Amino acid sequence: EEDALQMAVGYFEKGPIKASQNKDKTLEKHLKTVENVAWKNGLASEEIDILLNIALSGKFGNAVNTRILKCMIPATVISEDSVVKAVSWLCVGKCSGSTKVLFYRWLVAMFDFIDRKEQINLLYGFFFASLQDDALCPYVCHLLYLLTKKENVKPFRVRKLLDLQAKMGMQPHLQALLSLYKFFAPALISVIYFKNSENLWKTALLAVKQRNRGPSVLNNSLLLHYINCVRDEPVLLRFYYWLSQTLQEECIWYKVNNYEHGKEFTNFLDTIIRAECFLQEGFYSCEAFLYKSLPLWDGLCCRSQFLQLVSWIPFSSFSEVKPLLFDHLAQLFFTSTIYFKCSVLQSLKELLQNWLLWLSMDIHMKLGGSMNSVSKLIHYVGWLSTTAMRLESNNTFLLHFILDFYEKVCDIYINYNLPLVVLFPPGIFYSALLSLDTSILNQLCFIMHRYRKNLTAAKKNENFSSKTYQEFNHYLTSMVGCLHPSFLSYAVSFKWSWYLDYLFSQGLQGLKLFIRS
């Protein structure tokens, strides 16, 4: 009946209100109760916004009383905007400026629901030339802030906005439009923010939302994929120089606060760390800042961030990176507590993976001198991790992280296709063999079982063989005869096969992988 009722309203417009036998506000108010349910179909919204607002009865109260609720049920269509731009014709009838204010507020509030916003954008100048009149500027500014595309930023419009700014005030709406025009082709330069006033309409417009429901590059994850894919010269250098001068200036920022600046630097180094974990190669300013700031470094100043930066260090030689960095990750490793000690063999644990990834595809993209680098890194950690074992009187926490490093040394051949089976230095092997807990004992057992698996796999494809097999049979005969204190703890808590089952069943999985082997 609304289509019939709205054509009756049009008849109420083809004739005067006085000549009508019934009131408009009665029938239009029945339509208003309908709007409280569903205000205007796309065709209905079109027509009732067209004829009620061009010239006809459309009282600046009545046309507004509808215009407060003359929005759309499904979506507003182009033909709605078409001849209401002929209500924007703004002439003998003009739908005088108050109803113009509610009309441009209509468009601002329902800019989100148009099928083809490009059509209205193609109508950009028709509303841009409506910016000159004073009453619609606070609302037309919002509308063009919502309508603006690069094709609509012709320099004459830039000069018109500048003329409007000079003639009129510094009004924040003009500033917002100027911000967009600066975001596009910068023929103008300037340095509130979509704070809307349709909130009163957003009773009805929130109903409309519910009705539709029912009826330089680090902080850009979508752009980080580009730099991930371009190993180009002027972009990895445009980016290196920013990282070096951000990790210098904002780290000199420590020397003046060291407490409150120690939270944005931590949260910026976290973004660097995440960008490297995604992009997967160490930023060439990440190491260059590390060699510069490792000797000066303390134990706990951004430890969680600095020792994740070490992980992403472009594999260099372990003869040019050892003296520069690893001679300081031993200068602090041997002087700091366990809680920094475990944070280095973990840091170098992740460094080992981030070097072995880049070596796996060095096999994929077609060695020996690269081989000697990871082998020497592991031995130097294996040198690091026998004397850290001695500093802390065989602390089980530290050796747990040591094995966590070595949990990624057993599986070099199986995981990374690298023939680099490096066995335990005995200062860890027997120190965990004759250790006193099983969460470290089964850890060692898992590592050596993966060592058996990796050595057997290396025997298939092929110094390692002679001395490495000798050392692993040493670690075998000594230990397989030894396979005991934490097992004694279990036995006290506790028929050999049943003892096994009591084991095995109770989480001893590294022991399972050995015993099955």
């Binding site: 706990l300 430890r303 969680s304 961030q305 020792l307 994740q308 507590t337 809680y339 920094f340 475990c342 944070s343 973990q346 840091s347």
Partner: peptide, 12 residues
């Protein structure tokens, strides 16, 4: 991480 965690057992 276990580095951000290892910085809060140093304190705690």
């Amino acid at each position: 991480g276990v580095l951000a965690h290892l910085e809060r057992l140093e304190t705690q």
